[PDB]
Design a binder for this molecule. Structure first.
Ligand SMILES: Nc1nc2c(ncn2[C@@H]2O[C@H](COP(=O)(O)OP(=O)(O)O)[C@@H](O)[C@H]2O)c(=O)[nH]1
Ligand SMILES: [Mg+2]
Lengths: 331, 27, 98
């Protein structure tokens, strides 16, 4: 468990925050939000919870991600979770969080394949995290089922747009492997909001369920559909493994064995897997935080130059100075 | 006037400290 | 007929999706024509494009017959009983698995 790529950046944020708080001002540390776009049952929730490093989201066959859960990670001194609709309660166990999320979804949408545009706001405080926004959006579908209205397709798409047309957002586009990449909706959306690939990261899931004799070797090499940041393959837990309470360590070991043994992927083994995605996102955040330094320097330099002309005289103030008095008199 | 002087000097030193920290953070 | 796609590849024009539908509409919107809607089993049925088209041109289900073509590749731990029994997305003529 855990995510150790945060540890090397947290003290940088703290030091910058302290440097600005010294003057009664904040730091414009506008880190990008992370939005996970995907088709229904593409695996977009298991990827997200593998980036956080905690097993707390509901996942599984069927329509589970019924509401647009928004997770806020706030750096703190201890570890706890809270909900805006459960104000005053404290959650010390992620299993309770998962069960409460399910109960809150059912309470509003019912037991059919319902949806609700209103998000759930879950905030987790921990000394090991950064101030991040994570958005788990409901998967897109083509036809209504259950008691959904005829426009279910358009309501879901509209829920996505308000979160991915915003600047400073990473579109983490998840598509299954045992399907044809040309028919992945997540990539159609990315091309509608990021016409040139600067933020979009491709992730290919379900590589272990490919039809025997076929592989995706020409997809992972960024040949079929060029994407500025390529595609990162991952292997998540299967439905049997979720129901079997499979450990996370075993899943990572199985993923590593899969890539090391597969005849068509050995040469890419060091470019794929869960920990590689963690490094890519952490590197993306680090590149962002460094890119803003010229603005902070220019603001501070301008303020310093503005005050210096008067500081030069204030620093020379003395309780007894007949020349200072005379200068003021003449002026 | 005394209060304005004191605030200007405090802000001056704090801004100098902020630059001395940011430059070291960038490395 | 050629299958529907969302993302153009291989120098296909950006409107490849609309040209494919235009070809499809000239055969499935005709009367006295049966439509067989082919959907994979490994991909969630709510995503099926064939059912969307059949639903648009045969709201009543008189002509549409559904088929589930890839039961061999189901993810271990799941099955499609709730589709083949015409419960998840009831279709007048049911579904045939192959
Ligand atoms: N073996 C395997 N199972 C997967 C993969 N991706 C998703 N699944 C399974 O698909 C089911 C639904 O995944 P889920 O993430 O809940 O879909 P979503 O939450 O609707 O995006 C779960 O049983 C997952 O374990 C994969 O890459 N490999
Ligand atoms: Mg999903």
């Amino acid at each position: 468990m855990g995510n150790r790529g945060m540890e090397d950046l947290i003290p940088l944020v703290n030091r910058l925050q302290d440097a600005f708080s010294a003057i009664g001002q904040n730091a414009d540390l506008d880190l990008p939000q992370i939005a996970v776009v995907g088709g229904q049952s593409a695996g977009a929730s298991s990827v997200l919870e593998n980036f956080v490093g905690r097993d707390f989201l509901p996942r599984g066959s069927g329509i589970v991600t019924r509401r647009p859960l928004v997770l806020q990670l706030v750096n703190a001194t201890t570890e706890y979770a809270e909900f805006l609709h459960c104000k005053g309660k404290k959650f010390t166990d992620f299993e309770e969080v998962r069960l409460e999320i399910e109960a809150e979804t059912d309470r509003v949408t019912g037991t059919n394949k319902g949806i609700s545009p209103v998000p759930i706001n879950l905030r987790v405080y921990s000394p090991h995290v950064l101030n991040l926004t994570l958005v788990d959006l409901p998967g897109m579908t083509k036809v209504p089922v259950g008691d959904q209205p005829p426009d279910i397709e358009f309501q879901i798409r509209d829920m996505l747009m308000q979160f991915v047309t915003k600047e400073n957002c990473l579109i983490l586009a998840v598509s299954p492997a045992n399907s044809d990449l040309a028919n992945s909706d997540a990539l159609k959306v990315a091309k509608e909001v990021d016409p040139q690939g600067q933020r979009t990261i491709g992730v290919i899931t379900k590589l272990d369920l490919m039809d025997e004799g076929t592989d995706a070797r020409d997809v992972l090499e960024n040949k079929l559909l060029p994407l500025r940041r390529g595609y990162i393959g991952v292997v998540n837990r299967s439905q049997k493994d979720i129901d079997g309470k499979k450990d996370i360590t075993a899943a990572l070991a199985a993923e590593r064995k899969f890539f090391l043994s597969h005849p068509s992927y050995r040469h890419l083994a060091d470019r794929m897997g869960t920990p590689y995605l963690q490094k890519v996102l952490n590197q993306q955040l680090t590149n962002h935080i460094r890119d803003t330094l010229p603005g902070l320097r220019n603001k501070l330099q301008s303020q310093l130059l503005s005050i210096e002309k008067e500081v030069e005289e204030y620093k020379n103030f003395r309780p007894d100075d007949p020349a200072r008095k005379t200068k003021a008199l003449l002026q | 006037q005394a209060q304005r002087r004191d605030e200007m000097l405090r802000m001056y030193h704090a801004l100098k400290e902020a630059l001395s920290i940011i430059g070291n953070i960038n490395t």
